[PDB]
Amino acid sequence: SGFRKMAFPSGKVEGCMVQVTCGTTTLNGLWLDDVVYCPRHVICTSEDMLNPNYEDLLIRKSNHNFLVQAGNVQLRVIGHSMQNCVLKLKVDTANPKTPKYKFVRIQPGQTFSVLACYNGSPSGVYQCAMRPNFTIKGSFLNGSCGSVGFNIDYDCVSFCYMHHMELPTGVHAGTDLEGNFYGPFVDRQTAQAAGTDTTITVNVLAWLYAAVINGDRWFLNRFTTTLNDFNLVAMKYNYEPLTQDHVDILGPLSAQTGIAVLDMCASLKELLQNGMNGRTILGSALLEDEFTPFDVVRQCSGVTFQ
Amino acid sequence: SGFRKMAFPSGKVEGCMVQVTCGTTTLNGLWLDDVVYCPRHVICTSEDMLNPNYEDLLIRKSNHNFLVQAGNVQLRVIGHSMQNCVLKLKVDTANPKTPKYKFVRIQPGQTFSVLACYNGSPSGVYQCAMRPNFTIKGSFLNGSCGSVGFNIDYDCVSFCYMHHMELPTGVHAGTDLEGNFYGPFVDRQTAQAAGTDTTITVNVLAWLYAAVINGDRWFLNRFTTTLNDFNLVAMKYNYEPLTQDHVDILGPLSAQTGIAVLDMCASLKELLQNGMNGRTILGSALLEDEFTPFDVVRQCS
Numbered sequence: 001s002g003f004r005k006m007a008f009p010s011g012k013v014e015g016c017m018v019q020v021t022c023g024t025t026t027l028n029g030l031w032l033d034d035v036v037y038c039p040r041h042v043i044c045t046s047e048d049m050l051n052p053n054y055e056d057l058l059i060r061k062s063n064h065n066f067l068v069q070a071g072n073v074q075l076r077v078i079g080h081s082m083q084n085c086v087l088k089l090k091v092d093t094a095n096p097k098t099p100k101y102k103f104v105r106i107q108p109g110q111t112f113s114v115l116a117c118y119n120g121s122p123s124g125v126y127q128c129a130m131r132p133n134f135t136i137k138g139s140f141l142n143g144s145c146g147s148v149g150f151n152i153d154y155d156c157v158s159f160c161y162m163h164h165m166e167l168p169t170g171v172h173a174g175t176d177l178e179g180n181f182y183g184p185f186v187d188r189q190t191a192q193a194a195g196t197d198t199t200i201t202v203n204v205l206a207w208l209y210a211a212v213i214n215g216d217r218w219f220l221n222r223f224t225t226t227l228n229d230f231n232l233v234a235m236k237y238n239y240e241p242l243t244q245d246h247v248d249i250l251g252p253l254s255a256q257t258g259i260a261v262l263d264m265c266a267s268l269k270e271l272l273q274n275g276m277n278g279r280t281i282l283g284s285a286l287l288e289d290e291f292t293p294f295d296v297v298r299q300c301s302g303v304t305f306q
Numbered sequence: 307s308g309f310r311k312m313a314f315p316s317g318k319v320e321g322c323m324v325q326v327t328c329g330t331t332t333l334n335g336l337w338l339d340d341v342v343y344c345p346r347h348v349i350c351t352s353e354d355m356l357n358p359n360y361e362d363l364l365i366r367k368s369n370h371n372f373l374v375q376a377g378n379v380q381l382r383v384i385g386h387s388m389q390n391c392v393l394k395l396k397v398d399t400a401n402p403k404t405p406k407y408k409f410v411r412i413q414p415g416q417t418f419s420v421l422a423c424y425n426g427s428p429s430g431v432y433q434c435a436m437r438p439n440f441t442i443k444g445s446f447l448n449g450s451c452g453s454v455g456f457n458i459d460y461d462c463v464s465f466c467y468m469h470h471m472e473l474p475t476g477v478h479a480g481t482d483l484e485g486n487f488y489g490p491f492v493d494r495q496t497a498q499a500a501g502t503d504t505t506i507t508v509n510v511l512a513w514l515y516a517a518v519i520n521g522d523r524w525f526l527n528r529f530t531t532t533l534n535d536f537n538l539v540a541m542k543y544n545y546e547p548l549t550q551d552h553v554d555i556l557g558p559l560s561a562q563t564g565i566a567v568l569d570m571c572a573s574l575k576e577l578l579q580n581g582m583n584g585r586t587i588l589g590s591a592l593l594e595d596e597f598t599p600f601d602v603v604r605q606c607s
C-alpha cells in the first residue's frame with residue numbers, strides 16, 4: 001500500500017556525471033563510452049547570450065579549450081563536434097561505469113527521473129513530467145545545466161532529457177540527447193514564453209485508477225460519458241483532450257478495477273464540478289497529473305483492494 | 307527556481323542490497339563489510355509469526371539455513387546472530403562497494419530517502435518523513451521487507467530505517483539498523499494500529515519559507531505571535547508543539563528570507579484558523595509537513 005512520487009534508483013546515472021569547463025563556465029556533462037555530452041551554450045560568453053552563432057564560436061576552440069573532470073581525474077579531450085544543441089566531446093578514456101543505455105525522445109505527458117547535479121556531483125533525484133507546453137517543472141539552481149532525465153525500465157537507462165535553461169516563468173527547457181529542444185525553444189535569451197499549460201488528462205485518470213487499486217472509490221458515480229462529451233467538458237477546465245490512444249493505454253487499469261474508462265471519465269467530470277468536499281485522494285487535495293498509466297502499473301499492486 | 311520532493315542519490319546504497327532466503331521466504335538484506343543485515347522475521351513460518359519465540363526459532367537455525375545472493379553470486383554465510391529485531395549474517399566476503407557509513411536513529415519529523423527493493427534488486431527511490439506516531443507513509447508491496455532508508459552527508463551514508471511491516475491502515479513500520487523499532491510495534495501477527503498522527507509544525511514552517519523563497523507571499527501578514535500563543539493554536543489543530551530548538555533550527559531560513567519565525571508563525575496560525583481561501587502554496591492545497599528546515603536550505607541553495 002501507499003503511493004509516492006517514485007524515481008528510479010540513480011546509481012547507473014551517477015557514474016556518468018562529469019564537470020565540463022569552457023572559459024569561465026562550468027556545467028555538467030554525461031560521460032558514456034568515450035563521449036561527453038553537454039549543452040552547447042557552455043561555449044557562450046556574456047556577449048553571446050542573445051544571438052550566438054555557435055558554428056563561429058566553436059571553430060575558435062581547440063580540444064584543449066575543454067576541461068572534463070570525472071571525480072578528481074582530468075579526462076583528455078581528443079575531439080569535438082556539435083549535434084543540434086549538444087556539444088559532444090570525445091575523450092581518451094571510455095567510462096568504465098557506462099550502463100546499458102539508449103536515447104529516446106519523449107512526448108508530452110511522459111515522466112522521467114531527474115538527477116540534479118552541480119559541478120559534476122549529484123545532489124538529488126526527483127520525478128518530472130514533460131508538460132503539454134514542452135516545459136518541465138523542475139528544481140534547478142545555477143550550475144545545474146547538463147543534468148539529465150531518464151527512465152530505467154528493464155535495467156536499460158533510457159536518457160530522454162538534458163537540462164539547458166530556466167525560462168523567466170521559473171519552468172525549465174531542454175533537449176533530447178540528440179540536442180533537439182523539446183518544444184519551440186531555442187538556446188538564446190530572447191523572449192520565448194511557454195504556451196499556457198494544461199492538465200495531462202490521461203495521467204489524472206491513471207492516478208484515479210491507482211486510488212481505486214489502493215482501496216478508495218468515494219469519487220465514483222453512477223454515470224458514463226461519451227468521449228466527445230468528456231472532452232467538451234474537460235477542455236473548459238484547461239485539461240488536454242483524451243484520445244482513443246489514451247483510452248486504449250488505460251485498458252489494463254480498467255480491467256484490473258472493473259471500471260470502464262468512460263466511467264472513470266464520468267468520475268473525473270464530477271470531481272472537476274464538485275471538488276473533494278474536504279477529502280483527499282492518495283493524500284492529495286488536488287488532482288495529480290504526473291503519474292502515467294505505465295507509472296501506476298510499475299508501482300501499484302496487481303491485485304485491487306476491493 | 308522550482309521546489310520538488312527530492313531524494314538523495316541512491317547509488318551508494320544500491321551497491322549494498324542483497325537477497326536473503328530462509329526456507330520459503332525471500333526478502334532484502336543490507337551488505338556492509340562482511341555482514342548482511344535483514345529483518346529477523348525472515349526466520350518465521352506463517353504459523354511462527356502469530357506468536358514467535360525468536361530466541362528459540364533462531365537456536366533451531368544454522369548458517370546453512372540462510373542463502374544470500376548478491377546479483378548472480380551466492381555469498382556463503384559463516385555466522386548468524388540477532389541484534390534486537392535485526393538478523394546479522396556474517397558472510398565469507400566483505401562488500402567491496404561498502405560506502406563510508408554510520409547507523410543513526412532518527413527523531414519524528416526527520417526525513418529520509420527510501421530505496422524500495424524486491425528480490426535484492428533496487429526498484430525505486432522516494433522521500434519519507436518519520437511521522438510523530440512513528441510510522442512512515444511509504445509505498446511498499448510484498449517482497450519489500452529489508453528495504454532501507456538513509457540520508458547522505460558528504461560521502462557518509464547514514465542508514466536510519468529498515469522496513470519490517472505494513473499496518474492495517476496501509477502505513478509502514480520498521481527499525482533502525484540496530485533492530486530497535488520506531489514506535490510501539492512488534493514483529494508478531496497480533497492487533498497493531500498506527501496511533502492518531504499529528505502534523506510536523508517545524509516542517510510546515512520550513513515549507514512556508516520555501517514558498518516565500520520561490521515567490522509565494524499571499525499568506526504573509528503584519529502580525530507576530532508568541533511561542534505560548536502559537537502552541538495553544540498548534541494543540542487545537544493537531545500540530546506538534548513548536549520548541550525554542552525548532553525556532554533556532556529555522557534561524558538560517560529566517561536569515562535567508564528575513565522573516566522571523568514568530569512572524570511566519572502568525573501566518574501559519576491564520577492559515578489554520580481560516581484555511582487557504584481557494585489559494586495554493588507551492589502548488590499544494592494542503593500544508594506540507596515532509597520537508598525539514600535542512601531539506602529546504604539544501605534544495606533552495
Ligand SMILES: CCCOc1ccc(NC(=O)[C@@H]2CC(=O)Nc3ccccc32)cc1OCCC
Binds near residue numbers: 142187190
Ligand atoms: C545562449 C543562451 C543560453 O541561455 C541560458 C543559459 C543558462 C541558463 N542557466 C540557468 O537557467 C540555470 C539553471 C536553471 O535551471 N536555473 C537557474 C537559476 C538561477 C541561475 C541560473 C540557472 C539560462 C539561460 O537562459 C535563460 C533565459 C532563456
Ligand SMILES: CCCOc1ccc(NC(=O)[C@@H]2CC(=O)Nc3ccccc32)cc1OCCC
Binds near residue numbers: 347447470492493
Ligand atoms: C513479522 C512482522 C509481522 O508480520 C509481518 C511480516 C511481514 C509483513 N509483510 C508486509 O507488510 C509486506 C511489505 C509491505 O510493506 N506491504 C505488503 C503488502 C502486501 C503483502 C505484503 C507486504 C507484514 C507482517 O505483519 C503485518 C501486520 C503488522
Ligand SMILES: [Br-]
Binds near residue numbers: 527528
Ligand atoms: Br490579514
Ligand SMILES: [Br-]
Binds near residue numbers: 528529530531
Ligand atoms: Br501583532
Ligand SMILES: [Br-]
Binds near residue numbers: 283286589590591592
Ligand atoms: Br495537494
Ligand SMILES: [Cl-]
Binds near residue numbers: 555598599600
Ligand atoms: Cl532540520
Ligand code: NA
Binds near residue numbers: 569570573
Ligand atoms: Na506576520
